Design a protein around this ligand. Structure first.
Ligand SMILES: Nc1ncnc2c1ncn2[C@@H]1O[C@H](COP(=O)(O)OP(=O)(O)OP(=O)(O)O)[C@@H](O)[C@H]1O
Ligand SMILES: Nc1ncnc2c1ncn2[C@@H]1O[C@H](COP(=O)(O)OP(=O)(O)OP(=O)(O)O)[C@@H](O)[C@H]1O
Ligand SMILES: Nc1ncnc2c1ncn2[C@@H]1O[C@H](COP(=O)(O)OP(=O)(O)O)[C@@H](O)[C@H]1O
Ligand SMILES: Nc1ncnc2c1ncn2[C@@H]1O[C@H](COP(=O)(O)OP(=O)(O)O)[C@@H](O)[C@H]1O
Lengths: 712, 551
């Protein structure tokens, strides 16, 4: 409980902290000594304590400037420690800030030397910002350097130096060197995993010695481009507070031979010198790509040198290596063996909550208009990684500038601040920017989370129970299976008429067990077969393993029934270990062309027939579609359900869509000539008159015959 | 020992001590008794007592070549033998020597060779020897043609009469320039495969000698459940289990009291296995099997025929030599699917205690299309190196061009008759099999595999259910009688369906051990929910084919 609550202070003094005597009693502090207050992200300061009985016990009084310097807000908890090693300063060097001296010239250092340090003995520390009043201005300077270390106190005999040039303020902010856990959202699981795999070796190495194990060193995080890998690495490095050193694949690969090895050796040696340290790499694929395609000697020697350096790392050393790559399988396989990068992590596209958090983080400095509905943007935007969200915000701001430019004239070199005061980003700007966006992650197989429950599934209760017994029990009750000795099956294959609710079933299954759904359509398999596609099935299954538990989906599996892809799929699936929580769900409308090998035990052996929806199922599905669209009061869907015998979910959805389109057209005409913003009976009448069936009766008979044949 | 409580520690019987990972004697290796013995024989004797070779008057062999799946401890094995013999050890990396400049690699090589020679009680251990001297037909570049030539010159120019032994390691045997296999070079071949259950148990004991294991440990169970795991995988599993234990204990967090409570339990090992993934099965490997003869049921005449075919020629080769008959090696099992052909092959291999090798249809197709890590040549070379062995070719009807068939025929013809290499072929479509493979001196013997009989079905049911609980008083004879016309696969499916029903009932009861076993009603429900997977047409076709063959 030594931590104390941060409180707003009316006083503007930069070297006085007022606390109650009971606050000293808690730590048994003695009057007349400075105290060290440490906040977050390795931010600390030393303040002269005063007794103010007015303040209630546990309440402090620190000006806003000190809190801003510490990077903390009101109401935070800061650790307070005594100052047994209080020391005075012998030589301090400080420089001014040019933007803070605007409007007044001259040398105010001499003006501030005496009045501000007249036997004050104000404790000082590296990087502190202190504000002094000169003439008609209040100028803030920074503590460039102080001796003796580490913080010391500003004694009168201390020699003060001011020989140098002013340094910008926002330059430090944009350095990117200061980013904590707060600057990331939507990666709670991956962030926690990285923290566990990094902090423990560095913060508490004694655990591994106590338990008798060599702590892991090789951590490899991979994900879609522009997903925040570098930002997450920087954030964790700063939060740890250990020494940092970064290597860029493009940078190292851009220098002639020899120089690359020299740089790598120097980096490793320097990191070893200043342990604990973290070594980070970027685009490790570029320096160590797949050997099967790059036969050049330069990359061979570079990768060999990297391997030798990794192997030669001493047994006991607080150094952790982190690598980044878009393709998990692109890097040379030699790096993935034990004693090297083995702790693999996959980062997927953020879900709705992740998108909301990212948008909140980015939209923290722009002049957001009064009417903003970030929740709606999060709901609409799917498949957007953080980088695309930042681009969307930038484009919306650009559109706002387009709208507001008419007031000003661009020829003049100055813009009136009155216009600047009016700048604001409205919802329409975000809508337009979203309309002019271009997501790219979704075009490739990427792991994403789904949140579909059994409610969305319109019926098929028996299939629901069968699927539950098949999947959920081994995922949440493996003890029973181990006790009985029965291994869990993994190969499930749905077959039936198209548009009967298969993908939604797979999503629901993935949601129930809280697993990362993976989608792989038949065209993707065909492209992989022809080689045009980048990722291969091996990559898909490696990502599935790294993201376990997972549910992989194979749509139109008959579209590849080609034999090489089938053979590779069989090999990868059989190689999978059953104990791992990995499941494959195949779908096909023609369960006859599939090669017999796929149906062997230990593979896609479970066969599930998907029948057409029943009247109750049709009614439930229609209700599910009609959740946001207002309906004519008294509208009855039972007649529609009864008149739609043999229909499929897709056909019912299209019926709803055409009815909505007719209602919209009627509204347009009425408005041109919104009193009627909903649908009425006539639209449904037209829709049902324009009804049909996507499946012929012959196909239904064939499906029934095949299902009965499989039963017998 | 090693040319060396406090006294014992000093004689080996602050980081500079532990980091110096040396003196790793025979104690720190398990599951490689045969290979360890071979390497010891080929290393210690030339070095320790070269006088013996002079006395017998013959030059000791020097060129050794080990190969095995990656991460099997080849480098560790070389280091251990070098430390045991007390001599100096040298290590070279193939990519490293290839990494350096064009002329720099040749320098490195010659300087290392001369430095070793001047001070040469020692072993020169090359690594990734394939990289420096890959298959000549594939790469013939300038540096590729230069470094290999320099290495060949150095090897052939070995001064002899010295105490230098050269050892090379490659994941695949037929992945180096063949010129290195001739006499006066790497000739003594050694194969290392995935260890058996005993080897994995030994590895686990070796690694788990410092970790604070919990009170209850069943390393025998871990060895039984872990199959196809290399030593590196075992070490990774142990590390993962320790990490899981640390994570579990991290929720309460340093005080020494908590550190004193650290303990690795069975749950941690189970979780680590759940998060493990061995990388050895996908490649063809050599192992051992222990399929007991009495394990299977029925087919007694087939058992006796196979015994006469395999055991007697190898058990009493003197009789065959005196008569002159050579051992039979071409056998082809044919019959309906799911009749346990692989089980019979494994049992036969266990009879002679040979190293069983398996090749599946997907591997055949991968080799056919050209995209595959290894070709039939590698499989046969490993079979020869690890002799005696029993190679199993599954789904010979899946190679329906003819390049793979021609290669297989050539390899089968090439091997010498005396060498103890046997081939067992399996196929459910005997018609498609190429007639050429049926010629004398090849896969000539045909063995029909009939479906199991009532007694065989009962034996199969009993064997499969030994490791599963059952209701006391249950009679499976009625089940066996009421399952005529089925196969082993159908019986296993019914058993697993009954187990699934028991699991469901137990889970529902716990939600609401009431039934830790399976009752008769469960079997009744399973059988009523399952039926034969083989039609009568297939049986009639098999009978007709058998009669035609008899004719
Ligand atoms: N939570 C977040 N997740 C992802 N990107 C984020 C997040 N918050 C901000 N960003 C923005 O994303 C970019 C940071 O990710 P970055 O572009 O470095 O990822 P990357 O593609 O993994 O990088 P690299 O260039 O190292 O391969 C910056 O634009 C940052 O503003
Ligand atoms: N008897 C053993 N067999 C296999 N591995 C073992 C054995 N004893 C220990 N190990 C562990 O397995 C690994 C074997 O050594 P190492 O990691 O060098 O693999 P390797 O197969 O020799 O490597 P490479 O072939 O790539 O040079 C090490 O982790 C070693 O600790
Ligand atoms: N139980 C259900 N049966 C059929 N369709 C359903 C069911 N529940 C919902 N639907 C609807 O079916 C439509 C088609 O879903 P989709 O996954 O494309 O089907 P498919 O996988 O058969 O092509 C979706 O709009 C979905 O809302
Ligand atoms: N005597 C036996 N005859 C037939 N099958 C058996 C026998 N003993 C065990 N089995 C079962 O046969 C199964 C092997 O099936 P499968 O691999 O299809 O046979 P094969 O590959 O030899 O055609 C094993 O799971 C095993 O439980």
């Amino acid at each position: 409980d030594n931590m104390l609550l941060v409180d707003d202070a009316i006083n503007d003094d930069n070297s006085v902290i007022a606390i109650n005597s009971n606050t000293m009693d808690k730590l048994e502090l003695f009057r007349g000594d400075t105290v060290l207050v440490k906040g977050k992200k390795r931010k600390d300061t030393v303040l002269i304590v005063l007794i103010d009985d007015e303040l209630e016990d546990g309440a402090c009084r620190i000006n806003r400037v000190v809190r801003n310097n510490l990077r903390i807000r009101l109401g935070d908890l800061v650790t307070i420690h005594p100052c047994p090693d209080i020391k005075y300063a012998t030589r301090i060097s400080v420089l001014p800030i040019a933007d803070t001296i605007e409007g007044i010239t001259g040398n105010l250092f001499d003006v501030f030397l005496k009045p501000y340090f007249v036997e004050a003995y104000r404790p000082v520390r590296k990087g502190d910002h202190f504000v002094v009043r000169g003439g008609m201005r209040q100028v803030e300077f920074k503590v460039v350097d102080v001796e003796p270390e580490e913080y010391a106190v500003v004694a009168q005999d201390t020699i003060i130096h001011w020989e140098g040039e002013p340094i910008n303020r926002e330059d430090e902010e944009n350095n990117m060197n200061e980013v904590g856990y707060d600057d990331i959202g939507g990666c709670r699981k991956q962030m926690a995993q990285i923290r566990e795999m990094v902090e423990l070796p560095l913060r508490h190495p004694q655990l591994f010695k106590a338990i008798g194990i060599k702590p892991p060193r090789g951590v490899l995080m991979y994900g879609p481009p522009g997903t925040g890998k570098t930002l997450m690495a920087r954030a964790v490095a700063n939060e740890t507070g250990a020494f940092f050193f970064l290597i860029n694949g493009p940078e190292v690969m851009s220098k002639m031979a020899g120089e690359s090895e020299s740089n790598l050796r120097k980096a490793f040696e320097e990191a070893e010198k200043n342990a604990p340290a973290i070594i980070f790499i970027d685009e490790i694929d570029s320096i160590a790509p797949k050997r099967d395609k790059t036969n050049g000697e330069v990359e061979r020697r570079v990768v060999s040198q990297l391997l030798t350096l990794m192997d030669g790392m001493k047994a006991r050393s607080n150094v952790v290596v982190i690598a980044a790559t878009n393709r998990p399988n692109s890097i040379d396989p030699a790096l993935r063996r034990f004693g090297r990068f083995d702790r693999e992590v996959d980062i997927g596209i953020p879900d709705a909550t992740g998108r909301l958090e990212v948008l909140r983080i980015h939209t923290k400095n722009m002049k957001l208009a009064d009417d903003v509905d970030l929740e709606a943007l999060a709901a609409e935007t799917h498949g957007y990684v953080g980088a695309d969200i930042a681009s969307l915000c930038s484009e919306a701001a650009m559109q706002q500038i387009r709208e507001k430019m008419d007031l000003i004239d661009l020829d003049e070199d100055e813009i009136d601040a009155e216009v600047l005061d009016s700048l604001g980003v409205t919802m329409d700007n975000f809508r337009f920017a979203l309309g002019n966006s271009n997501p790219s992650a979704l075009r490739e197989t990427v792991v994403e989370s789904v949140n579909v429950t059994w409610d969305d599934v319109g019926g098929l209760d028996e299939i629901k129970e069968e699927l539950k017994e098949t999947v959920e029990y081994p995922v949440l009750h493996p003890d029973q299976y181990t006790k009985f000795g029965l291994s869990p099956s993994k190969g499930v294959l749905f077959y039936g008429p198209p548009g009967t609710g298969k993908t939604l079933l797979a999503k629901a299954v993935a949601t129930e067990v809280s697993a990362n759904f993976i989608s792989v359509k038949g065209p993707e398999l065909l492209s992989m077969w022809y080689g045009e596609s980048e990722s291969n099935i091996r990559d898909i299954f490696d990502k599935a393993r790294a993201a376990a538990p997972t549910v992989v989906f194979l749509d139109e599996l008959d579209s590849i029934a080609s034999d090489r892809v089938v053979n590779q799929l069989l090999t990868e699936m059989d190689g999978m270990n059953a104990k791992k929580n990995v499941f494959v769900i195949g779908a096909t409308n023609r369960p006859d062309q599939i090669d017999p090998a796929i149906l062997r035990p230990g593979r896609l052996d479970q066969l599930i027939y998907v029948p057409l929806p029943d009247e109750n199922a049709r009614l439930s599905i229609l209700n599910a579609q009609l959740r946001k669209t207002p309906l004519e009061p008294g509208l009855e869907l039972t007649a529609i359900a009864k008149a739609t015998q043999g229909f499929s979910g897709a056909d019912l959805l299209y019926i709803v869509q055409r009815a909505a389109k007719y209602a919209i057209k009627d509204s347009i005409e009425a408005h041109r000539q919104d009193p009627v913003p909903y649908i009425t009976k006539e639209h449904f009448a037209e829709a049902m008159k324009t009804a049909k069936r996507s499946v012929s009766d012959a196909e239904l008979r064939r499906y029934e015959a095949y299902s009965q044949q499989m039963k017998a």
